């Protein structure tokens, strides 16, 4: 169960079923490639998932930036 | 469509913020006017009857 499998799963979940991508992240955040899933959530307009991943990875700067870019989401 | 809905929600939040700011400013102005009335009453209380 290498990190690549969970990474590709999170990558391919955004395109089809974004409602379960957050649930999969809350379970396997420690096993997903960071920049790939970040770019996937950016392309999928999943700002809440971006903030969650930034908070789990202690990336407060990008978290606050994404939060300010979307005040209502 | 999600971006349009987000823009609509941002506009609604801006409207609510303007309403809240206006209400807070009106309440602060009411408090300032009441303080001015209290100061006028205090200045009226300064009137006494001393010698020349």
Provide the terminal-to-terminal Cα distance of chain A, rounded to the nearest Å: 33
DSSP string, chain B: -HHHHHHHHHHHHHHHHHHHHHHHHHHHHHHHHHHHHHHHHHHHHT------
Structure determined via: cryo-EM
Neighbours of B40 (CB within 10 A): 10
CA distance A52 to B37: 52
- Number of residues assigned to chain A: 73
Rounded distance between C-alpha atoms, residue B52 and residue B50, angstroms: 7
Helices (H) and strands (E) in chain A, counts: 5, 0
Yes or no: say if A12 and A37 are a contact pair by the CB < 8 Å rule. Answer: no
Q: Is A45 left (phi over 0), alpha (psi -120 to 50) or beta?
A: left
Q: Which strand (E) or helix (H) includes residue A67? A: helix A60-69
Are the beta carbons of A72 and B2 separated by less than 8 Å?
Answer: no
**Cβ of A71 and B13 within 8 Å?**
yes
Q: DSSP label at A2?
A: -
Render A7-22 in DSSP notation, one character per residue.
HHHHHHHHHH-HHHHH
Query: How far is Cα B32 from Cα A42, in angstroms, rounded to an integer?
Result: 49
Q: How many CB pairs under 8 A join A and B?
A: 11
């Amino acid at each position: 169960a290498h990190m690549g499998m969970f990474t590709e799963l999170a990558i391919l979940y955004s395109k089809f079923k974004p409602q379960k991508m957050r649930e999969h992240l809350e379970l396997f955040w420690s096993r997903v490639n960071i920049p790939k899933v970040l770019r996937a959530a950016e392309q999928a307009h999943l700002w809440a998932e971006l903030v969650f991943l930034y908070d789990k990875y202690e990336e407060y700067d990008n978290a606050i930036i994404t939060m300010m870019n979307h005040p209502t989401d | 469509e999600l971006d349009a809905a987000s823009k609509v929600m941002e506009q609604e939040w801006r409207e609510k913020a303007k309403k809240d700011l206006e209400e807070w400013n009106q309440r602060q102005s009411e408090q300032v006017e009441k303080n001015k009335i209290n100061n006028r009453i205090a200045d009226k209380a300064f009137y006494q009857q001393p010698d020349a």
